[PDB]
Design an enzyme around this catalytic site. Structure first.
Site, mmCIF file in Angstrom:
data_model
loop_
_atom_site.group_PDB
_atom_site.id
_atom_site.type_symbol
_atom_site.label_atom_id
_atom_site.label_comp_id
_atom_site.label_asym_id
_atom_site.label_seq_id
_atom_site.Cartn_x
_atom_site.Cartn_y
_atom_site.Cartn_z
ATOM 1 N N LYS A 1 -1.607 16.385 77.634
ATOM 2 C CA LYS A 1 0.497 16.615 76.915
ATOM 3 C C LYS A 1 1.263 16.854 77.643
ATOM 4 O O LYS A 1 2.557 16.581 77.516
ATOM 5 C CB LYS A 1 -0.136 16.149 75.040
ATOM 6 C CG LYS A 1 -0.963 15.555 75.027
ATOM 7 C CD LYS A 1 -1.058 15.579 73.523
ATOM 8 C CE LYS A 1 -2.081 14.615 72.746
ATOM 9 N NZ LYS A 1 -2.507 13.184 73.383
ATOM 10 N N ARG B 1 20.525 22.536 53.908
ATOM 11 C CA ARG B 1 19.910 24.195 53.632
ATOM 12 C C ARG B 1 21.558 24.514 53.451
ATOM 13 O O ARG B 1 22.316 24.576 54.109
ATOM 14 C CB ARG B 1 19.455 24.572 55.182
ATOM 15 C CG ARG B 1 17.844 24.047 55.344
ATOM 16 C CD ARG B 1 17.663 24.375 56.432
ATOM 17 N NE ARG B 1 17.352 25.820 56.331
ATOM 18 C CZ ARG B 1 15.933 26.743 55.928
ATOM 19 N NH1 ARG B 1 15.063 25.385 56.129
ATOM 20 N NH2 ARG B 1 15.543 27.506 55.297
ATOM 21 N N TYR C 1 14.925 32.589 51.806
ATOM 22 C CA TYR C 1 15.893 33.598 51.406
ATOM 23 C C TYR C 1 15.388 35.140 52.185
ATOM 24 O O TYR C 1 16.295 35.703 52.388
ATOM 25 C CB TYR C 1 16.549 33.290 50.543
ATOM 26 C CG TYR C 1 17.696 34.365 49.760
ATOM 27 C CD1 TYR C 1 18.893 34.137 49.675
ATOM 28 C CD2 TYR C 1 17.096 35.516 48.874
ATOM 29 C CE1 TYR C 1 19.779 35.169 49.305
ATOM 30 C CE2 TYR C 1 18.210 36.377 48.097
ATOM 31 C CZ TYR C 1 19.131 35.969 49.301
ATOM 32 O OH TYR C 1 20.575 37.343 48.274
ATOM 33 N N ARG C 2 13.957 35.694 51.142
ATOM 34 C CA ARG C 2 13.646 37.120 50.889
ATOM 35 C C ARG C 2 13.120 36.790 52.746
ATOM 36 O O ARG C 2 12.859 38.785 53.095
ATOM 37 C CB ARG C 2 12.806 37.265 49.972
ATOM 38 C CG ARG C 2 12.198 37.985 50.287
ATOM 39 C CD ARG C 2 11.812 38.609 48.898
ATOM 40 N NE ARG C 2 11.032 40.206 48.611
ATOM 41 C CZ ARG C 2 10.430 40.287 48.817
ATOM 42 N NH1 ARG C 2 9.167 39.739 49.595
ATOM 43 N NH2 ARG C 2 9.953 41.710 48.626
ATOM 44 N N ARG C 3 12.766 35.947 53.316
ATOM 45 C CA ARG C 3 11.854 36.236 54.584
ATOM 46 C C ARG C 3 13.949 36.903 55.922
ATOM 47 O O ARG C 3 13.802 37.186 56.905
ATOM 48 C CB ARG C 3 12.660 35.022 54.942
ATOM 49 C CG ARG C 3 10.892 34.221 54.524
ATOM 50 C CD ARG C 3 9.716 33.984 55.795
ATOM 51 N NE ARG C 3 10.326 32.375 56.230
ATOM 52 C CZ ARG C 3 10.863 31.384 55.858
ATOM 53 N NH1 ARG C 3 9.802 31.336 54.203
ATOM 54 N NH2 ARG C 3 11.414 30.343 55.471
ATOM 55 N N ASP D 1 16.188 26.110 49.945
ATOM 56 C CA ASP D 1 15.953 25.676 48.604
ATOM 57 C C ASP D 1 15.994 27.310 48.205
ATOM 58 O O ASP D 1 16.014 28.643 48.753
ATOM 59 C CB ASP D 1 14.639 25.319 48.120
ATOM 60 C CG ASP D 1 13.192 25.787 48.443
ATOM 61 O OD1 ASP D 1 13.379 26.735 48.921
ATOM 62 O OD2 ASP D 1 12.481 25.327 46.886
ATOM 63 N N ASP E 1 13.993 29.789 45.407
ATOM 64 C CA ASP E 1 12.581 30.665 44.900
ATOM 65 C C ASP E 1 12.846 31.563 43.777
ATOM 66 O O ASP E 1 12.862 32.476 44.433
ATOM 67 C CB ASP E 1 11.775 30.438 45.433
ATOM 68 C CG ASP E 1 11.435 29.277 46.585
ATOM 69 O OD1 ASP E 1 11.061 27.881 45.917
ATOM 70 O OD2 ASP E 1 11.582 29.282 48.299
ATOM 71 N N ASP F 1 14.407 26.415 41.617
ATOM 72 C CA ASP F 1 12.731 26.804 41.421
ATOM 73 C C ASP F 1 12.753 28.063 40.810
ATOM 74 O O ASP F 1 13.223 29.250 41.606
ATOM 75 C CB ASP F 1 11.420 26.976 42.374
ATOM 76 C CG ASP F 1 11.286 25.659 43.417
ATOM 77 O OD1 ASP F 1 12.506 24.641 42.955
ATOM 78 O OD2 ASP F 1 10.786 25.866 44.501
ATOM 79 N N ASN G 1 1.194 31.681 54.624
ATOM 80 C CA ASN G 1 0.319 32.172 54.066
ATOM 81 C C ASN G 1 -1.123 31.192 53.790
ATOM 82 O O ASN G 1 -1.942 32.039 53.815
ATOM 83 C CB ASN G 1 0.899 31.174 51.906
ATOM 84 C CG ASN G 1 2.087 31.863 51.659
ATOM 85 O OD1 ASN G 1 2.180 32.658 51.381
ATOM 86 N ND2 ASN G 1 3.294 30.906 51.805
HETATM 87 CA CA CA Z 1 11.931 28.142 51.878
#
Ligand code: CA
Ligand code: NA
Ligand code: NA
Length: 320
Positions: free
Chosen positions: A62, A136, A168-170, A177, A179, A235, A258
């Site tokens: 492809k 976002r 966010y933490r990344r 969102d 967390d 969350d 993960n």
């Molecule tokens: Ca996120």
DNA sequence: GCCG
DNA sequence: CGGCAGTACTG
DNA sequence: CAGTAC
């Protein structure tokens, strides 16, 4: 980056396979997309693509058609239902099975869903904030949201720890969102705090709707006070402190990160989850847990990497 | 769809 | 051939 | 349990 002309064509087929229920074929497309975006040069040969991990014989064929003819013939044979299924699956709480049933019932727009479709409590909320949930937020706004929850939680227990994870933490400039992870280092004062925390957030009009109100995790909608504020996804997961490192690592992300970490855990006779990094987890030939194993002490995120034989990666380095 |  | 992350959650 | 999202 330099192969976007090839990744954009496969990305359309990846969403089409995803919304149509073929989650595993869509998984192979997603990992080939992430491999092409991180490759070192624009692919120019069939053997060059096959040598890449995540790209087999079919995916390289492809890639060859996109370079030679400039198009993917399968994009001309995408089912006309796909754009409608993507509209329905974006409703929070509505997935591939619900979107396929709504298209089967003859629905083609969100107006048909609002007036004729049977909606769950979560699907009605996700529809009520359909435009707001696809946006976002700037990470500045996410900071205001984390401080709103942290001040309400620390109002009853100043020793509580609150960390915003996810994109966010990344370190991402924008966040899909928020967390918020809550815990207490004494291992016990986190008990029964959901009723007092969420009620305090509702008295101030911060929480607008509730999606999931569980024992450990809470999913819902919130909006900062004042004008010009969109409804954002929020969350709030509350965990025992003995499980704080694994919960922090899972909820920081990314999702594929993960899935590669927990796969590597399985290849080492271990099992990684948002609760603990168990070792000597017994399984059968199907990769299914038959023995619970023993929880390994993971006080920090670096300990999860160390017990997995991996060098530690900062949250910004966990996008793959 | 990919991979062992 | 057959797994592909693990789990909380909700009806 | 299937379905959904974390
Ligand atoms: Ca996120
Ligand atoms: Na290969
Ligand atoms: Na959705």
């Amino acid at each position: 980056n330099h192969n976007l002309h090839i990744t954009e064509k496969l990305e359309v087929l990846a969403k089409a396979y995803s919304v149509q229920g073929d989650k595993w074929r869509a998984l192979g497309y997603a990992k080939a997309i992430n491999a092409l975006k991180s490759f070192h040069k624009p692919v120019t040969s069939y053997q060059e693509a096959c040598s890449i991990p995540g790209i087999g014989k079919r995916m390289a064929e492809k890639i060859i058609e996109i370079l030679e003819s400039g198009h993917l013939r399968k994009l001309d044979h995408i089912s006309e239902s796909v754009p409608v299924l993507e509209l329905f699956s974006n409703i929070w709480g509505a997935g591939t099975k619900t979107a396929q049933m709504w298209y089967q019932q003859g629905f083609r727009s969100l107006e048909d869903i609002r007036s004729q479709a049977s909606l769950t409590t979560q699907q009605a909320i996700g529809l009520k904030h359909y435009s707001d949930f696809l946006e976002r937020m700037p990470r500045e706004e996410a900071t205001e949201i984390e401080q709103t929850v942290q001040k309400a939680a620390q109002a009853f227990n100043s020793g509580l720890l609150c960390v915003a994870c996810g994109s966010y933490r990344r370190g991402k400039a924008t966040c899909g969102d928020v967390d918020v992870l809550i815990t207490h280092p004494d291992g016990r004062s986190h008990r029964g705090i959901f009723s007092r925390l969420l009620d305090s957030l509702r008295q101030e009009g911060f929480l607008t709707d509730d999606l999931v109100k569980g024992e450990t995790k809470y999913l819902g909608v919130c909006r900062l006070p004042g004008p010009g504020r969109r409804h954002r996804r929020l969350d709030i997961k509350v965990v025992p402190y003995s499980e704080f490192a694994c919960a922090l690592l899972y909820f920081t992300g990314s999702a594929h990160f993960n899935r590669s970490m927990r796969a590597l855990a399985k290849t080492k006779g271990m099992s990684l989850s948002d609760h603990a990094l168990s070792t000597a987890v017994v399984r059968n030939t199907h990769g299914c847990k038959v023995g619970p194993g023993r929880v390994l002490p993971t006080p920090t995120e670096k300990d999860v990497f160390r017990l997995l034989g991996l060098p530690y990666r900062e949250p910004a380095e966990r996008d793959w």
